[model samples]
Target: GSSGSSGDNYRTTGIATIEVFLPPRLKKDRKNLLETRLHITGRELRSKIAETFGLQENYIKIVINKKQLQLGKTLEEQGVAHNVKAMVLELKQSSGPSSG
Candidate 1:
């Protein structure tokens, strides 16, 4: 089976690699590192993380280089390099009004 889907040409590159760390702010004694392909997009990464933690993609937030990963771009396009370390966190829910 293939690792990526259509139009994911960069998935074959062996240089793609990144490390993910679960944010301490979200949980305690939660130290885990994930090594994955760098060609994955922010949205895809969020979905993967959300699935791994039994959560929703909208609840996941990925940050790299001290900034939130742009959901519109792939990690490679975002200038992410091999061996890069990024943080995965749960998005803060707004306490405001909601549609009834």
Candidate 2:
């Protein structure tokens, strides 16, 4: 018997990815302060992400290479990457309308 929707009958989900490139501040003389600022920036970023995505802070599962990254580490990584100044790279949920 034929069914309306078969298990093998799959289609694209229409997921979208948006990358916001936020620049890092250059501080040659004040690395400590710069790092502090970066930390704050990362916090703000995470806050905004959670707010926009409507996800609780604890529910936000942010990891890299399967290991959970600390808030500070995430910031530093965002500040420097690939031998060049770094920026935040976020991957949020984006699901499209589906048909049955």
lDDT of 2: 0.39
Candidate 1: 10-residue stretch with minimal lDDT: 25-34
lDDT per residue, candidate 1, 1-100, as tens digits?
6697557545555455556676655563445555556667767877876776666777778888888887789877877777777777776866778779
Model 2 misplaced stretches (Cα beyond 4 Å): 1-43, 77-100
Q: TM-scores, in order shown?
A: 0.65, 0.31
Supply candidate 2's per-residue lDDT for 8.
Answer: 44
Q: Which residue pairs collide in model 1, if any? A: none
- Write out the backbone clash pairs for model 2: none
TM-score: which candidate is best? 1
lDDT of 2 by residue, 2-77 (tens): 7686354587432222232232532223211111233343455456445544445443534433344356654555
State candidate 2's TM-score: 0.31
